[PDB]
């Protein structure tokens, strides 16, 4: 079961998905902007990887730089409109503007491309309820 290799071969299939692992893992390592850094490089690997864009959005909220957080988005669904997470933090940015109307349709949205997303719905209630007060 020895996984036979030679020294000019790449045991990492695609680079550009380890190199998006380790800037998830420097976010778990209790980072945020040298992590939105390694999304960005990542995005420097995948362009088109729309749901890395969504990492730096979800960052952008803490760093109260929401315009950032709206506007990758914008353009996120443009490259790959089946960024799933990424409609959940939209939806979070929302709440901060106060639209939990325009919120709760966008996480309706994450739930939409996939109801496993269901992470989103926790963050639906937390829209819903925010006007419900």
Do not use: W
């Not at 030679?6 to 893992?25: F, Q, R, T």
């Not at 999304?39 to 803490?62: F, G, H, V, W």
């Not at 933090?89 to 496993?116: C, F, G, I, N, P």
């Amino acid at each position: 079961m020895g996984h036979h290799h030679h020294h000019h071969s790449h045991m990492n299939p695609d680079l550009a998905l380890m190199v998006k692992n380790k800037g998830n893992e420097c976010f778990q390592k209790g980072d945020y902007p040298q992590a939105m850094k390694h999304y960005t490089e990542a995005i420097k690997r995948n362009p088109k990887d729309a749901k890395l864009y969504s990492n730096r959005a979800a960052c952008y909220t803490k760093l109260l730089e929401f315009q950032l957080a709206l506007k990758d988005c914008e353009e996120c669904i443009q490259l790959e409109p089946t960024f799933i997470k990424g409609y959940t933090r939209k939806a979070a940015a929302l709440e901060a503007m106060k639209d939990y109307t325009k919120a709760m349709d966008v996480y309706q949205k994450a739930l939409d491309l996939d109801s496993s997303c269901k992470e989103a719905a926790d963050g639906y209630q937390r829209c819903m309820m925010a006007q419900y007060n």
